[PDB]
C-alpha cells in the first residue's frame, strides 16, 4: 500500500512495467496502463493469470474469479476484468481523484533519457514527478552499467600500465574518468572487492585508489549501487522573515569576511538562499565565514564529491576550533584532521549519499551545478535545517548525464535550485574575481554572467588565443587534435616559461598524446573545475556540441591566475576571447 505520485490517492497498486515500480491509484494505474505499453499490475499481489502455465500479464486481459487472478480462457464463470471503468482494481477503490494530463508521468514512466527533453520535463513537472523522475533516471543509470561487458586482467605488461580482455556480446564503456572501474580477485567459491580503478588508452593506463601487484584473472565492472526511493522535495517551502532568525550575529566580525556581511543576514533571514560564485569569487571563503558570523550556530557542510567537502574542511583548518569540526566518512582518502564520525559535533562536514539524520541551524551545500534533483531530495530528507545555503555557479559544469545524446542540457535544467537562478536569479553573488588576469574576467563576464563579474586583478597581457583547425582524429569514444598539440609544442620553444602551464582540453585522449610530446600535467576542463593554475594551454581539439559547451569553456578558461593559451577549432568563440590574437607559424 502507498501513495499515487500524480494524485497521492491512497493505494495498493505499483506498476510492475516501470522500473521504480510507482504506486499509482485505481485512476491513476488505469490511465498509465491504457495509455502505454506498461500492462504488467502490482498489488499486495502481481495481476497476473494464476493459471498453471498461462504467459498472461497484460491487467487489461486479466479478471478476479475468486480471490486468483485469471486471463480471458482460464477465468471461472463468476469473475469481473482486473480493469475496467477507468479504474484498475485494487484497495481505496472509493479514494481516487485522477488528473486532468496524466501525459508527464508516462513520458518519465517510459523514456530512455537520451534526449535533453527528457531532464527538460523532469525538472519542469510537478515535484512529486521531480523525485518519481530522479529515481526513475538513477535507476535506469545504474542498470545501464550492467549492460557493459567486464573486463579481464589478460597480461601484466608493467606497473600502472595492463592488457585488459572484454566478456563478448556486450559493449565497452568509454575509459575515461567518469568511468570509475572496481577491480575483484578470484577466490574459491566467491569475489571480494580490490579498491576502485579508473583507465585510458596505452593497453591501458589504470590509475587506482589503492597499489597493489594485482594479476591475471583480476576483472573490473563498474560499480552500480541501490537508488533508495526519494520522499523529500528538492527544495523545501520559501520562506521570507522580516528579522534574522534563530541565529546570532557577532558583534565583532574580521576585515576578511566583512564583505559578505549583509549577505549572511540575508541568509538568515529566509529559508534558503541562493549564492552564484564565479570562478575565484570566494564560494569557500563564503561558507565557512557564515560560521563565525554565527558562532553559537550548528552548521552541516555538504556537497556531491568527496573533493568539494574536503575544500570545505581545508578553508575550516584555517579559520574554526579543529575541536568543533567533525568528517563524517560511510565505512576512498579523504580529508582526516577532524574527529571521523562525529554526527553531534558543532560542524559536520559530510557528502550527500553519506549524510545521517540530523537537525542543524544552518545547511550549506556546495557546487550545486554538480548537484541532481536525486541529491537535493537526499539532503532535505536527512537535513532539517533552520537555513539552508546552496553555493555553487550554474554558469560552471553539471554532473555528467551518461544516457544524454540528443540536445544540449542548458543550466536552468541542471536541477532545481539552478532551476531558480537562472530564472528568478540568485539570492546573492559574488561579483569580484580574485584569481584571473583580467581578459579572462572580462570574457567571461560577457559570456555568462551580464557583465556583473569584475576583474580584482589588472590584464597580464599573457592571455593568447590562436584560431587553428588543424586535423581531427577520434577513436572509441575521444577525440585527438595532433596539430594543435604541435602549435603547442612549437609555441613551448619560443615561449619555455610556459612549461609551468597545466594542459586542459575537452578530451582525455587529447590530453593523453599532450601528455607524451608536451610533458605538460594535463586535466579535462571537467576535472579541472574547482582547482586553479598559474599557466593554462587549452587546446579545443573540435567544434563539438561538448567543445563549444559555454559552461565548459567558462571553467577552461577561468583556471589561470597569471596568463592563458587557447588553440581554438570554432570560430564563434575564438571571436568571444578578449585576447592577444596570435598568427600560425
Ligand atoms: C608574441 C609571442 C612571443 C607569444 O607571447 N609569440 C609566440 O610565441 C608565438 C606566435 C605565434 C605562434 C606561436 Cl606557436 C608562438
Ligand atoms: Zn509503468
Ligand atoms: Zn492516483
Ligand atoms: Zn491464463
Same mark, same amino acid.
Given at each position: 500500500v502507498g501513495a499515487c505520485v500524480l494524485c497521492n490517492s491512497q493505494t495498493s497498486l505499483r506498476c510492475g512495467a516501470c522500473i521504480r515500480r510507482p &504506486? %499509482?491509484?485505481?485512476?491513476?494505474?488505469?490511465? =498509465?496502463?491504457? @495509455?502505454? @505499453? =506498461?500492462? %504488467?499490475v502490482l498489488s499486495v499481489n502481481p495481476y497476473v493469470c494464476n493459471a498453471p502455465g498461462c504467459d498472461v500479464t497484460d491487467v487489461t486481459q486479466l479478471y478476479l474469479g475468486g480471490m486468483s487472478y485469471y486471463c480471458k480462457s482460464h477465468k471461472p464463470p463468476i469473475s469481473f476484468p482486473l480493469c475496467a471503468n477507468g479504474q484498475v482494481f485494487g484497495l481505496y477503490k472509493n479514494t481516487c481523484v485522477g488528473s486532468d494530463n496524466?501525459?508527464? &508521468?508516462?513520458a518519465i514512466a517510459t523514456c530512455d533519457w537520451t534526449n535533453a527533453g527528457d531532464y527538460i520535463l523532469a525538472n519542469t513537472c510537478t515535484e512529486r514527478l521531480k523525485l518519481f523522475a530522479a529515481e526513475t533516471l538513477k535507476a535506469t543509470e545504474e542498470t545501464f552499467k550492467l549492460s557493459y561487458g567486464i573486463a579481464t586482467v589478460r597480461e601484466v605488461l608493467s606497473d600502472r600500465e595492463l592488457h585488459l580482455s572484454w566478456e563478448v556480446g556486450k559493449p565497452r564503456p568509454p575509459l575515461n574518468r567518469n568511468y570509475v572501474f572496481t577491480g575483484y580477485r578470484v577466490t574459491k567459491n566467491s569475489k571480494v572487492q580490490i579498491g576502485e580503478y579508473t583507465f585510458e588508452k596505452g593497453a591501458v593506463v589504470?590509475?587506482?585508489?589503492?597499489?597493489? /601487484? %594485482?594479476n591475471v584473472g583480476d576483472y573490473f565492472v563498474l560499480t552500480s549501487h541501490t537508488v533508495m526511493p526519494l520522499s523529500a522535495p528538492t527544495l523545501v517551502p520559501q520562506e521570507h522573515y522580516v528579522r534574522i532568525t534563530g541565529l546570532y550575529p557577532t558583534l565583532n566580525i574580521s576585515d576578511e569576511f566583512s564583505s559578505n556581511v549583509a549577505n549572511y543576514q540575508k541568509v538568515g533571514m529566509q529559508k534558503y538562499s541562493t549564492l552564484q560564485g564565479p570562478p575565484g569569487t570566494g564560494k569557500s571563503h563564503f561558507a565557512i565565514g557564515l560560521a563565525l558570523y554565527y558562532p553559537s550556530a550548528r552548521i552541516?557542510?555538504?556537497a556531491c564529491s568527496h573533493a568539494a567537502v574536503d575544500a570545505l574542511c581545508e578553508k575550516a583548518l584555517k579559520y574554526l576550533p579543529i575541536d568543533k569540526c567533525s568528517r563524517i566518512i560511510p565505512a576512498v582518502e579523504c580529508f582526516d584532521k577532524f574527529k571521523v564520525n562525529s554526527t553531534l559535533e558543532q560542524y559536520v562536514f559530510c557528502t550527500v549519499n553519506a549524510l545521517p539524520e540530523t537537525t542543524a541551524d544552518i545547511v550549506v551545500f556546495d557546487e550545486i551545478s554538480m548537484a541532481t534533483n536525486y541529491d537535493l531530495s537526499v539532503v532535505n530528507a536527512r537535513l532539517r535545517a533552520k537555513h539552508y545555503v546552496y553555493i555553487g555557479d550554474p554558469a560552471q559544469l553539471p554532473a555528467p548525464r551518461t544516457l544524454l545524446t540528443k540536445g544540449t542540457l542548458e543550466p536552468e535544467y541542471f536541477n532545481s535550485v539552478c532551476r531558480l537562478m537562472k530564472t528568478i536569479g540568485p539570492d546573492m553573488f559574488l561579483g569580484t574575481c580574485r584569481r584571473c588576469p583580467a581578459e579572462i574576467v572580462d570574457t567571461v563576464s560577457a559570456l555568462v554572467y551580464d557583465n556583473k563579474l569584475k576583474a580584482h /586583478?589588472?590584464?597580464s597581457a599573457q592571455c593568447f588565443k590562436m584560431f587553428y583547425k588543424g586535423v581531427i582524429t577520434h577513436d572509441v569514444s575521444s577525440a585527438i587534435n595532433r596539430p594543435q598539440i604541435g602549435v603547442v609544442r612549437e609555441f613551448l620553444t619560443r615561449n619555455p616559461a610556459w612549461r609551468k602551464a597545466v594542459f586542459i582540453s575537452p578530451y582525455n585522449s587529447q590530453n593523453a598524446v599532450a601528455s607524451k610530446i608536451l610533458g605538460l600535467p594535463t586535466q579535462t576542463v571537467d576535472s579541472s573545475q574547482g582547482s586553479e593554475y598559474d599557466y593554462v594551454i587549452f587546446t579545443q581539439t573540435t567544434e563539438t556540441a561538448h567543445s563549444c559547451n559555454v559552461n565548459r569553456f567558462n571553467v577552461a578558461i577561468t583556471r589561470? /591566475?597569471?596568463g592563458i593559451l587557447c588553440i581554438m577549432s570554432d570560430r564563434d568563440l575564438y571571436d568571444k576571447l578578449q585576447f592577444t590574437s596570435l598568427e600560425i607559424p
Open positions: &504506486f %499509482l491509484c485505481c485512476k491513476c494505474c488505469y490511465d =498509465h496502463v491504457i @495509455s502505454t @505499453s =506498461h500492462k %504488467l496524466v501525459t508527464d &508521468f508516462n589504470y590509475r587506482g585508489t589503492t597499489t597493489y /601487484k %594485482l552541516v557542510y555538504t /586583478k589588472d590584464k589561470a /591566475k597569471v
